[PDB]
DNA sequence: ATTATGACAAATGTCATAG
DNA sequence: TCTATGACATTTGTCATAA
């Protein structure tokens, strides 16, 4: 899926036969890809999904994300920590508060991801104004936010914190 | 290319031809995928990436910035609009003029990006005392100002407009 | 426990055309 | 506009070789 993560697998010194048995993709494909005989883009979704998921599980333990945010005053700095983007968001909201980020940013991200018209919910600086419509959406079957969406919540928000830097450490 | 995200594009009510035009995937492939004659798993990463990027763009959250500024007296009012801080600044200069904002604030921000000492740079309210240093800066591209620098330009200014306020809506 | 190369049936992407 | 169906050169996935 993420061509970056599968590219990091080719960068890895793990054996092509080890990759072949761990993911299920043949050693032939892995050897030809690293050699340059094959291109990752030309590969199928199923095999690429296998390679990406395996590396993602491997990186799950040695991954730490430190968020940095700067307000207008030099003194105010917002920093959060976690191994997952969602963890960083929860650490931030308990550490600092929901009102630091843009009003109702989580709900707005969820609505747009699910294909809902923002106009119906009366979006404004004051947040979601049509609370009753949001309540109808909460009961309705929806698609829960993925980790990447949580990073977007910080970058999208500029009302209080307009500078966003994330540190990703792979060991 | 998350298969769930691509499926939400194929399960939308959007035309297979329109999806084909915006993404670049052939209408043939998109239609066969929707029919069931082809499978997403068998598709190449490049095309699946194209589909993924368009659905990601559709689900992306929009940002609109309304800037409000006032003089110390509060008799004089200034208002600007843009989806980026750079767009807000460009609108402000087009509507009001470069002189109203702090003199050579754009250059001050550039020097701050370089890290060159402001005191050594002959900093003054009048503007750039040292023309020589300007050509020195012209020699190096250095770092072109990022969007956040444009908000900082407004907040740094004290002369003329002294009250700076940014409101963000994600409609 | 490794690493390159096939062969082969089956798909793909890029173009069309037809309705 | 839009859908469906295909042509063609070409890369795939699987399953092997050989070293």
Numbering used by the authors:
A (entry chain B), B (entry chain D): 0 to 170
Quote the paper.
The AcrIIA15 protein, consisting of 170 amino acids, is comprised of two domains: an N-terminal domain (NTD) from residues 1 to 56, which contains a HTH motif resembling a transcriptional repressor, and a C-terminal domain (CTD) from residues 57 to 170. Our structural and biochemical studies demonstrate that AcrIIA15 functions as a dimer to simultaneously inhibit both anti-CRISPR operon transcription and SaCas9-sgRNA DNA recognition.
Based on these findings, we utilized this specific DNA sequence with one base-pair overhangs to form the AcrIIA15-DNA complex for subsequent crystallization experiments. To investigate how AcrIIA15 recognizes promoter DNA in a sequence-specific manner, we determined the crystal structures of the full-length AcrIIA15 or the NTD domain in complex with IR1 DNA at resolutions of 3.15 Å and 3.10 Å, respectively. Resembling a canonical HTH-containing DNA-binding protein, our structural analysis revealed that two AcrIIA15 molecules form a homodimer that binds to a single IR1 dsDNA molecule using its NTD. Each HTH motif of an AcrIIA15 dimer binds to one copy of the IR1 inverted-repeat sequence in a similar manner. In the AcrIIA15-DNA complex, the HTH motif and the subsequent loop establish extensive interactions with the phosphate backbone of the DNA.
